[PDB]
Design a protein around this ligand. Structure first.
Ligand code: K47
Length: 826
């Protein structure tokens, strides 16, 4: 039971719990105890919530950011369904009320006691919301499908809640002694050290002498730094870099001079180094776990006298004219100006806190103590301000603790929109228990959808040693917190476990035998008991509310590309057509870049919708779940503009010229005046994806990676190369699109200038929120993507949105780019 839950978590996280105990570190032991307690208290509250409050945890509503419609309804036990026609503006209780009135006539004799469950889905309909605000209903409007829902009584929800139960005196200069190590390289060796407190150095760099190449070396040199022992800030970071010289990089290593309990670190320390591709402060403050092959370094940290960092009480005891002109990087005369006027910054420019923190001297403990005094009575800044404060440039913990006080006011949906970045910031952390972790973990245990996504965001990075312990430990506390969801997640891992083995079997066979022979062999490998049991009946990792019930083996296949991605189709009896959903399993390519690009498109859709403009965007699911291994959501009822341009023999869209093909495919898929809606659908999405790709700098755009839905909506795929790193992009407007936009006419400036309008409106709304994009991409520098490595990459976004201009200039300049693509298009 306890052993059963323990051996489950080990299988689930992919690391044995004993592997934590083997280290015997009191931090890891303190983390595991302090968290377990926290998450168990979270689970205790969760068990005594109301039935409607449990639905908000387990099935959080899926809402969007007059004209009646057909609706199907039924009850939990029976299969007898009733069909209604009710308003888009009707509340779910008005619908529920009818469902009782129809049973009152057939069955022959209280709405608030029930909830509306979406058939064959982990989605419910409740609350004070008109039915056109739900995703499943709004989906059914556009798509023309019929909502089929089940009436679940309060006691039936409560039956689940029960079954889903578990000091300043040290003025001497700072110094350390570089003793000895052990490595392999072909010259002489040097050991450049250097202190830091974020990206900035606490003092100058101090390189060692030249020892020879043949080495298991010894130095024993007292390296003295240009900073006092009391001047050191609580989050002081000492880095090191080993390299050969006649340059030749070899390895790096870092550590916190203070321990986790606030005490200075003592005498001798062994530091196992990580390999290089000159100095790296961002790199983790934990030794290389490959204790064997990793080159080590023993160093001595002098005995200064027990010295803890001072408590807050001790830290608490210790013209406005040309001020604004600069406040909108800065010179030293300006930096001094900003530090001098720090009180009026709190009292009349609180949102400038970040620019003020960067001017303070962290290598002089007076300026630090004076800054921390202001921060204790600084007002709550908005969410965008707090996001700026979570970057690597503000390592101080009182800042971090403040940013979390500000972030606490995030909506469960905004948290989900930012969660990816919040996880990459966990890499920057110095100690295991922290606010961010405690916060994420608490939000995760109050929302099963956050719990789900946070879990896969951690699990997908376990193959990386820099974070294996950190994440493994976090996932463990989540599993202590949600013992029922843990089991739900194990079924997904085991599905993914089989999907891996199936894809290797698919990779070999496809080389040897032909495609159809590999296909019937894939189907046979699938028909087995283990595969049918493992790949069936599970919540989708791409979306916890979608249920991947029965696998339709006949339809499952694999795309003919390189990594042979598996196409896996499903179907549900209960959900009907809403259960017929597919997934794509890729193996051997990292999908974290695709996930970020899709997050950015999903944000752009949300920003535009929030300013009344729906461009009919398609931010389909993409989810890394392991080492070069994730899931992509099959977008159904769509084809590539390459397959449509094949102009296939005796089809419903036989066209004479390529330019007409696109439009002819639309005419066949949408008969009557449905075509007018499909062209309107095409036009907005076309305008949408033109702006998103321009801004995100997505290149290598060809007919085989631009799709189009049967509804008319245009959408892009393969987001492996962005920010103009093919693996400065121009604006794109293919002639075949301009034809469909212009209703198939050579001249239609009425419909074209409308389209141009959408591209301009969308471009500006993004520019307004250019900081949000900057602050989210700023935190992702922690991930370690090849194309989001440095400031030069971020710069692409600054220059694409032109944040260093006015709305006149930016739109004046953007109007030229559009014309330059319009002209280039034949
Ligand atoms: C990161 C890569 N990425 N991102 C989005 C995607 C991706 N490719 C998709 C696709 O591609 C078509 C293109 C060829 N094809 C087939 O031949 C099918 C024929 C019938 O049996 C099933 C296969 C499927 N169709 C639908 N959704 C897709 N998605 C999300 C991909 C692959």
């Amino acid at each position: 039971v306890k052993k059963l839950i323990n051996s489950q978590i080990s299988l689930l996280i992919g690391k044995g719990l004993h592997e934590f105990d083997s280290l015997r570190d009191p931090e890891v032991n303190d983390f595991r105890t302090k968290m377990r307690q926290f998450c168990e208290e979270a689970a205790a509250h969760r068990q005594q919530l109301g039935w409607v409050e449990w639905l908000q945890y387990s099935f959080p509503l899926q809402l969007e950011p007059n004209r009646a419609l057909l609706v199907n309804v039924k009850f939990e036990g029976s299969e007898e369904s009733f069909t209604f026609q009710v308003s888009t503006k009707d509340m779910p209780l008005a619908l529920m009320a009818c469902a009782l009135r129809k049973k009152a006539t057939v069955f022959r004799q209280q709405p608030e006691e029930y909830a509306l469950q979406v058939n064959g889905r982990h989605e419910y309909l409740y609350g004070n919301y008109p039915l056109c605000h739900f995703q499943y209903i709004c989906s059914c409007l556009h798509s023309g499908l019929t909502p089929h829902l089940t009436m679940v009584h309060s006691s039936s929800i409560l039956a689940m809640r029960d079954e889903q139960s578990n000091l300043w005196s040290l003025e001497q200069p700072f110094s350390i002694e570089l003793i000895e190590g052990r490595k392999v390289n072909a010259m002489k060796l040097v050991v450049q050290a250097g202190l830091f407190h974020g990206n900035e150095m606490l003092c100058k760099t101090v390189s060692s002498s030249e020892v020879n190449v043949c080495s298991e070396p010894v130095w024993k040199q007292r390296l003295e730094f240009d900073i006092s022992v009391c001047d050191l800030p609580r989050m002081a970071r000492l880095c090191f870099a080993l390299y050969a010289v006649v340059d030749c990089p070899i390895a790096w290593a870092n550590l916190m001079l203070f321990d986790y309990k606030d005490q200075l670190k003592t005498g001798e320390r062994c530091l196992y180094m990580w390999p290089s591709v000159l100095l790296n402060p961002a790199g983790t403050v934990r030794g290389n776990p490959n204790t064997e092959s990793a080159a080590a370094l023993v160093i001595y940290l002098p005995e200064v006298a027990p010295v803890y960092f001072p408590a807050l009480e001790k830290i608490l005891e210790l013209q406005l004219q040309l001020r604004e002109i600069l406040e909108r990087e800065l010179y030293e005369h300006e930096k001094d100006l900003v530090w001098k006027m720090r009180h009026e910054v709190q009292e009349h420019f609180p949102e400038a806190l970040a620019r003020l923190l960067l001017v303070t001297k962290w290598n002089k403990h007076e300026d630090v103590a004076q800054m921390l005094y202001l921060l204790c009575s600084w007002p709550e800044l908005p969410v965008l301000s707090a996001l700026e404060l979570l970057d690597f440039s503000f390592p101080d913990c009182y800042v971090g603790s403040f940013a979390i006080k500000s972030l606490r006011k995030l909506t469960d949906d905004e948290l989900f929109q930012y969660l990816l970045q919040l996880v990459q910031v966990l890499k920057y952390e110095s100690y295991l228990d922290c606010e961010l972790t405690k916060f994420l973990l608490g939000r995760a245990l109050a929302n099963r959808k956050i719990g789900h996504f946070l879990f896969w965001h951690l699990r997908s990075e376990m193959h990386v040693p820099s974070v294996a312990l950190r994440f493994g430990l976090i996932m463990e506390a989540y599993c202590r917190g949600s013992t029922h969801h843990m089991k739900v997640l194990m079924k997904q891992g085991e599905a993914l476990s089989k999907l891996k083995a199936l894809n290797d079997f698919v990779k070999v066979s496809s080389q040897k035998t032909t495609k159809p022979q590999t296909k019937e062999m894939m189907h046979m490998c699938m028909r087995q008991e283990t595969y049918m049991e493992a790949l069936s009946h599970l919540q989708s990792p791409l979306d916890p509310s979608t249920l991947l019930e029965e696998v339709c083996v006949e339809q499952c296949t694999f795309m003919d590309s390189k990594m042979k991605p598996l196409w896996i189709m499903y179907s549900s009896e209960e959900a009907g057509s809403a259960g017929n959903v597919g997934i794509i399993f890729k193996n051997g390519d990292d999908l974290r870049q695709d996930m970020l690009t899709l997050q950015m498109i999903q944000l752009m859709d949300v920003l535009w919708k929030q300013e009344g403009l729906d461009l009919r965007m398609t931010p389909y699911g993409c989810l890394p779940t392991g080492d070069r291994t994730g899931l992509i959501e099959v977008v159904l009822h769509s084809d590539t503009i390459a397959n449509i341009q094949l102009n296939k023999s005796n089809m419903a869209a036989t066209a004479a010229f390529n330019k007409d093909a696109l439009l002819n495919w639309l005419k066949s898929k949408n008969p009557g005046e449905a075509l007018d809606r499909a062209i309107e659908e095409f036009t907005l999405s076309c305008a949408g994806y033109c702006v998103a790709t321009y801004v995100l700098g997505i290149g290598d755009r060809h007919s085989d990676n631009i799709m189009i839905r049967e509804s008319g909506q245009l959408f892009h795929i393969d987001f492996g190369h962005f920010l103009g790193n093919f693996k400065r992009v121009p604006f794109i407007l293919t002639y075949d699109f301009v034809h469909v936009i212009q209703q198939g006419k050579t001249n239609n400036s009425e419909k074209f200038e409308r389209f141009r309008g959408y591209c301009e409106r969308a471009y500006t709304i993004l520019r307004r929120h250019g900081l949000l994009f900057l602050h989210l991409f700023a935190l992702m520098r922690a991930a370690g993507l090849p194309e989001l490595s440095c400031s030069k990459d971020i710069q692409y976004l600054k220059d694409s949105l032109a944040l260093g201009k006015t709305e006149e200039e930016a739109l004046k300049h953007f109007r030229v780019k559009f014309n330059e693509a319009l002209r280039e298009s034949w």
